[PDB]
RNA sequence: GGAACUGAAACAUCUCAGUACCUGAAGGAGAAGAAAGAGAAUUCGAUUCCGUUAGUAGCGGCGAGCGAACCCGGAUCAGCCC
RNA sequence: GCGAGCUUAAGUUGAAAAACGGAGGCGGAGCGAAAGCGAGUCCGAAUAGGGCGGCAUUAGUACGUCGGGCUAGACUCGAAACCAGGUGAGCUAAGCAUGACCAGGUUGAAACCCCCGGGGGCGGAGGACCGAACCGGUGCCUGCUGAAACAGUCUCGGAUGAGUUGUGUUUAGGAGUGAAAAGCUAACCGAACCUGGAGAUAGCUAGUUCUCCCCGAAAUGUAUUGAGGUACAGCCUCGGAUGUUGACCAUGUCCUGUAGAGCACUCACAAGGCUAAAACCUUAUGAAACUCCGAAGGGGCACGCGUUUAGUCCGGGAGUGAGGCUGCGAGAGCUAACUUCCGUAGCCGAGAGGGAAACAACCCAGACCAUCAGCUAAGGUCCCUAAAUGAUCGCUCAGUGGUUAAGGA
RNA sequence: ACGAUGCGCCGAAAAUGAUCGGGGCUCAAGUGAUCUACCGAAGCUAUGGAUUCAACUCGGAGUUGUCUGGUAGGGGAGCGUU
RNA sequence: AGUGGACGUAUAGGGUGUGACGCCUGCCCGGUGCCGGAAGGUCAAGUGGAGCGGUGCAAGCUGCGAAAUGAAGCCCCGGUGAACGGCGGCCUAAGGUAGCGAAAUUCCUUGUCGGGUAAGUUCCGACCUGCACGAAAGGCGUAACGAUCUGGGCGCUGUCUCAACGAGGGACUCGGUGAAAUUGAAUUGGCUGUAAAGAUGCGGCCUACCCGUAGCAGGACGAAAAGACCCCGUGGAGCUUUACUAUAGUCUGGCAUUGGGAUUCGGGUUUCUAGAAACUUGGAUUUCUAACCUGAAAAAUCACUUUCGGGGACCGUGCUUGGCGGGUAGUUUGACUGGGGCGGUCGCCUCCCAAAAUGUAACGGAGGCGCCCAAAGGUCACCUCAAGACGGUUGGAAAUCGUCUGUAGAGCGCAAAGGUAGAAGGUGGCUUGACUGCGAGACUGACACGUCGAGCAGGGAGGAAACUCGGGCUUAGUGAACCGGUGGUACCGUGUGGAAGGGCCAUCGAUCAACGGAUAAAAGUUACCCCGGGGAUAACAGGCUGAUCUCCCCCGAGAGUCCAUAUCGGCGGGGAGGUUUGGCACCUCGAUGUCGGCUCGUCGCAUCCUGGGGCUGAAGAAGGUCCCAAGGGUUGGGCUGUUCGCCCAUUAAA
RNA sequence: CACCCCCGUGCCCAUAGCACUGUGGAACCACCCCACCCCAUGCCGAACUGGGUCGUGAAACACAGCAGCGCCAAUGAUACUCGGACCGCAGGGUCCCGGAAAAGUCGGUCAGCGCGGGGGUU
């Protein structure tokens, strides 16, 4: 062994609460950890960044159904 | 050897090459597709080579 | 005739360098010199030396690095003979 | 100094003094791969960008000093080597010419001649024997700042041969010579010596001196024919600008899958009932790569509803890129190590002062200077040794105190 | 009689000479609990004193605050020799 | 040029290896070498120049440029061993002829038996199981020889038990002369602790009047040479070869020196009733003597002449071609690494570690990638998977159909994590968005790279439309830079116009996998070693630890007929000591001398003897085993360097 | 939001779901109804789909009861932990302050809010 493979370093780059450009990056994910609210639009890589510039914020029933949105 | 090959792909007028893999593997001859490269529209590229 | 350390963080092309060195000829100097040229204005008008053009052009495992010439400004300016 | 401009170089003329000398250099426009356009320009078929001017038009240039950089010995000393042209065979390694030397004793080959290959004579051969010179160094010892930079006593090898030795002479540097050790080539030969290239290179070592003030690190990350070295970040400092952006703490919010805890999936696993045993139920458990769950904390944002003083960028100079311990959390190890590798906090490095007998790391506490002044921290108060042989309820009679455990009493 | 426990006994052998730092300590100088009183540092306080910075005033000075452990290093003021 | 070989000439000269003499010297031509062959394969310059292009109005000039024909040499085919060699592993060209064998060769090894000694790791003779013998890198013998090595025996000895007495030269004392290596400074003790872990110099405690002198050799990690061992340096040098590169030398084709001619000519021209005389441009054998080389004669090397003699247009030499070329030469020969080597690893992806942000090491624990898919894409539309039970045709645990349960227990191309049931899974229709030009904004990185990306243009594709397309559910499927190939384009293109060449856009060439990648192009060895450094780093020794080692204790199964504990103590557990093999890397590489012996010793006690005990399966005696006890004592020899161990022969005991 | 009830479409996002079950009927919805063709089944008008009444609330669906199941879920007490401060040689553990689960019990629920329309009491 001692094979091992580069860091990724995914994770929510947008906290709820944090106004965003257009296009800013707000969660990194293998999948779809988030599923994306209103206003955001999802990658190739399943990461999903805002289109209109605002606040974030988190709709989270959770357990696959957690969602973010950004307010304008 | 190899088994897929990086083909070439020549517009009728023949201004342009898109260049893609394809693979001797299904494609026993075939490669017919299309491109927009001088001429406005996309036109009929065979990609023998 | 003609190095090698060395640099290239190795090392062959490259550089170090036509350096060091050996050998020949000669003088108070020597060399060179009176365009089958530079050059791109149908200009220049022998040779040598300084400034500059200029690290420009360019050469280079296009790497380390190596690097002009013309224009122009001065020092000195004689062209003579088969 | 002059300033939207600034200034010479070579030289010329003077020199107890400096002036002339505009060839030339820098600023003035940028974009482009370039043609080339031009405050626009490249990409492109037009519109999206990059660099750029407007705007802040940030003013440049000739010198001086100084910080750095470059190139050249480039802070000083220090290689083993390499190359060039020489000097050396007067030592030694061989050759050649020519001369010389080897006491003495032992043995008795042929050939030659007689009696029958054998006996006798005779003869005087030998890389023969012994042993002096001489040549050589076999073993111990002595000598070991020697009597001597290779010897001495004693012992030993040869000693007519492949011998020793004089003179003269020839052969040398990757070359000679070598009955072959890489031996000898002028007392250090796996490539002599001298002069030179030449201050070779040296990522390696050591060394780098007058004083005071201020600030103050790093031993980390990535890359590397890289790992004890460099590049760029990270951290230090000096200046300019900005102007609280810093920092801790509080509120609000969001994100997380650890501790714990659980079996709901995966692996495992404990007693039974059930049954063609997988499955199934009651009961019972472990899990870094298991999770129905899941804190404490922790990170980002916003505020400051609150105390504080840092921060940010831009330009000059750096060094550091070997860390060490302790505690907590893991891995590796044997739940070893003053072990090794990470996270994290603090000390040490760079830290003085009191405590811990002593003691970088531990506990206390960050030394501007002076005092024969006062309160305290940790730690202490019998004598050493500063300070209650302090007070009150016990506990242990073992010197336990002042070195462990399973286990026994 | 099994039990909880507090302090102790045994378990308990290493190499030059012993020891808690030593003396000595139960007629506490051990101990667990409390409470004082003092010792005790270059920490803090007092008086004097000077630098770094910054505000505040007059054409470096002086006041108030504040700061001053220090390796590589960066900066600054100065002393000595020809 | 000249010399040596050699004033020699195959009974001689050169090289290589065996190494008198004796009997001898087996097998294997596959590779390598070499010697022959030389049907065919390939192969340089040169001869040829068909064609492809520029540039000019053109004549012409000019850049490329095939086919065929071109030597040696290599591939191919024989052979060669007193050529390099090979003659073994529960197919290779063969597999060991004689002879020898525990060897100078034997690891296990002190092999087994015998010999010799009281005792024999040695030695000798047999045996053979030859790790890992062997036939001219010679095998088996050999008399004689050896300052050769090994084993034995005689002889005599101070080698020794075990030393004593004597001599002389030192050594010591006095007078004369009088150095040296060394040297931080010294007002320089013992223990025990402590500190970089071996203390005169730090702590406590003990001891010690000041100073000499003759002695000894424990300490001052004493002295001496900036460790010759080990590691490091993108140090060095010597040596090696099928590492690389060249190259003296050497072989080979063509051109010149270099020529007449006959003779066969694939061919040239004007020549003539498909034709041949003048004639060749050459090639080819063959031959010739003026070039040249060489030799003999009064004139030694050289020149002349030679009645002369031989070779001969070759040989030798000049240029150029291609091959051979460790003989020479200049160099290359990676790093991490609980010391170097060996093994492993070097880039990208997944998980745990990773301590609920991102990040985080290890030669830590697990596994994948160097691709695929013309549809496994875009779009439009449509289906729902495992598994179980009941029932069923040849099948039955599981083909296939049929019902019931069925937030998934399936699937997703490959590895896993995330994710997914309103699909990313499955199945069709259409077509290529597997587009060109751009890139607001961010994520990530020291850079450089990398990731995601709304929306705009030109134009497509699917859908009735909203809309979705600039690749795949996602994360691996990859290499800057240089130097070049191919297609466009019309920017530079040196006087001008062109062209040669260059630039740009597209694309191709990389286990450069040591995967940020030193060159286009590179292996060993050093014990003849050299330099510079390192306690940054091994071998010793000390230290820390104590796995392993040594020891003790608890339990108690059984053994002990009986009876656990007189003794012994399974399977398990707890400690101690630091003597073993270690680990670790802390002081020491400007030096800490290392194993065994000898000489001196001193200490512990886990006690071999001796002394005092308890229990005993202790009648007695001799014992066993445990306790207290460190005063003293603990033998001599054979074997081996040994420690050890074995043995002889004794002991209170060894 | 006059009172109910139906068809649909949202918010919510198992305290709403399952099962047992009962009411429902031409009003709404639902099966049945036929198929050469629109349109379709990798076979079947089962599915889409096109042409409709009877019939029937069977099945599905809507709506009520329902605490067997699932789903949620305290308090309390712990586990753990931020800071502080300790002991054990060690594995390990304690104390002060404050934050504090998971599992289980107690107990809670077969929901809750819109919007448009259709038909009822005519
Ligand atoms: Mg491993
Ligand atoms: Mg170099
Ligand atoms: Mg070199
Ligand atoms: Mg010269
Ligand atoms: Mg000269
Ligand atoms: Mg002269
Ligand atoms: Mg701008
Ligand atoms: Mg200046
Ligand atoms: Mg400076
Ligand atoms: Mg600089
Ligand atoms: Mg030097
Ligand atoms: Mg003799
Ligand atoms: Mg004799
Ligand atoms: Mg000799
Ligand atoms: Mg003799
Ligand atoms: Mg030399
Ligand atoms: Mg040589
Ligand atoms: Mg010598
Ligand atoms: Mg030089
Ligand atoms: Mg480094
Ligand atoms: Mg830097
Ligand atoms: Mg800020
Ligand atoms: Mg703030
Ligand atoms: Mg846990
Ligand atoms: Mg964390
Ligand atoms: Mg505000
Ligand atoms: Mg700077
Ligand atoms: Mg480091
Ligand atoms: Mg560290
Ligand atoms: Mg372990
Ligand atoms: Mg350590
Ligand atoms: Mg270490
Ligand atoms: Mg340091
Ligand atoms: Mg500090
Ligand atoms: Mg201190
Ligand atoms: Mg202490
Ligand atoms: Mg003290
Ligand atoms: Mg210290
Ligand atoms: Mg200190
Ligand atoms: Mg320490
Ligand atoms: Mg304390
Ligand atoms: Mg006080
Ligand atoms: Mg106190
Ligand atoms: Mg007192
Ligand atoms: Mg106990
Ligand atoms: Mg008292
Ligand atoms: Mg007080
Ligand atoms: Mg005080
Ligand atoms: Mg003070
Ligand atoms: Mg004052
Ligand atoms: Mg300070
Ligand atoms: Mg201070
Ligand atoms: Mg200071
Ligand atoms: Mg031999
Ligand atoms: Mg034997
Ligand atoms: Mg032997
Ligand atoms: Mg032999
Ligand atoms: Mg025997
Ligand atoms: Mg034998
Ligand atoms: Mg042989
Ligand atoms: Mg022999
Ligand atoms: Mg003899
Ligand atoms: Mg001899
Ligand atoms: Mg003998
Ligand atoms: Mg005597
Ligand atoms: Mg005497
Ligand atoms: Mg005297
Ligand atoms: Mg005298
Ligand atoms: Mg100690
Ligand atoms: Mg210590
Ligand atoms: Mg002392
Ligand atoms: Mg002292
Ligand atoms: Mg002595
Ligand atoms: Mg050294
Ligand atoms: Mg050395
Ligand atoms: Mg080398
Ligand atoms: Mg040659
Ligand atoms: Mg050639
Ligand atoms: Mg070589
Ligand atoms: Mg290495
Ligand atoms: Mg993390
Ligand atoms: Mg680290
Ligand atoms: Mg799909
Ligand atoms: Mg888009
Ligand atoms: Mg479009
Ligand atoms: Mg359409
Ligand atoms: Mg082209
Ligand atoms: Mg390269
Ligand atoms: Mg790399
Ligand atoms: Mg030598
Ligand atoms: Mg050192
Ligand atoms: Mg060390
Ligand atoms: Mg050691
Ligand atoms: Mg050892
Ligand atoms: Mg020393
Ligand atoms: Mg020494
Ligand atoms: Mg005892
Ligand atoms: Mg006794
Ligand atoms: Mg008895
Ligand atoms: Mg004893
Ligand atoms: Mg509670
Ligand atoms: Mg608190
Ligand atoms: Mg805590
Ligand atoms: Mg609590």
Not at chain 2, 20 to 36: F, G, I, M, S, V
């Amino acid at each position: 062994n001692g094979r091992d493979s580069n860091p990724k370093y995914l994770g929510v780059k947008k906290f709820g609460g944090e106004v965003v450009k257009a296009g800013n990056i707000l969660v990194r994910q293998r999948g779809t950890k988030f599923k994306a609210g209103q206003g955001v639009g999802m990658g190739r890589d399943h990461t999903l960044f805002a289109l209109s510039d605002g606040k974030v914020v988190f709709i989270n029933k959770g357990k696959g159904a957690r969602f973010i949105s950004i307010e304008a | 050897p190899r088994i897929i090959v990086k083909m070439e792909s020549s517009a009728g007028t023949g201004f342009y090459y898109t260049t893609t893999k394809n693979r001797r593997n299904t494609q026993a001859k075939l490669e017919l597709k299309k491109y927009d490269p001088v001429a406005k529209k996309h036109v009929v590229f065979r990609e023998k080579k």
